Symmetry: C3
Subunit: 73 residues, 3 copies
C-alpha cells in the first residue's frame, strides 16, 4: 500500500491538515491583535489582505489536486 499514487494522496491529506492548522493560528493572532491594537495601524490591514488572498490561493490548489486524483479513468 506504499506506491507513488498512494503517497501522493497522503501528502495531500497532510497539506490539508496543515492548511486547517494555518487558519487556526490566523484566528488566534486576530483575536490577540484585536485586544491589543484595535484598528489596523502598523500594517495589520495589508496583513489581513495578504492572508485572505493566500488562503484562497491555497484552498483552490488543494481543490484542484483533489480533482486531478479523482479524474482517474
Amino acid at each position: 500500500s506504499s506506491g507513488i499514487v498512494q503517497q501522493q494522496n497522503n501528502l495531500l491529506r497532510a497539506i490539508e491538515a496543515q492548511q486547517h492548522l494555518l487558519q487556526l493560528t490566523v484566528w488566534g493572532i486576530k483575536q490577540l491583535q484585536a485586544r491589543i491594537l484595535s484598528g489596523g495601524r502598523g500594517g495589520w490591514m495589508e496583513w489581513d489582505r495578504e492572508i485572505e488572498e493566500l488562503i484562497k490561493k491555497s484552498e483552490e490548489l488543494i481543490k484542484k489536486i483533489e480533482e486531478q486524483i479523482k479524474k482517474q479513468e
Copy 2:
C-alpha cells in the same frame, strides 16, 4: 531527479513546515497566556482543535515516511 526523489523532498518541506507550525502555536499560546489568563473566550476549544490537527498531521507524515521506506 525523478518522481521518487522529488516526493522525498516534498516530504522534507512538509516536515519542516510542520515544525514551523508547532513553533507558531507555541508563540500564540505564550501571548494568549499573558493577555488573558485562562481558556475563556474560545481558547479552550482552540487548544483542542489545534492539538487534534497536530497529531493527525504528524501521523500522516510518519505514514508517508514509512511508505517511502517500505518501497526500498
Copy 3:
C-alpha cells in the same frame, strides 16, 4: 492529470503555505514586540529556530522547482 502534474500543484500548495507561515510569524513577532521588552522566556531561541526552519524549507522548495524543470 498525472503524477507529474500533481507534484507541481503540490509544490504550489506548499509554497503558498510557506508564505502564509511567513505572514503568521510576522504577526506573532509584532505582537510580542508590543507586549514584551526583551527576548526573555524563550523568545530568543524561538526567533532563531523560526528563522532557521524558514530558510531550510524555502531552500528545499526552490530546489524542487529547479529539479523538476531540469527534468524538462
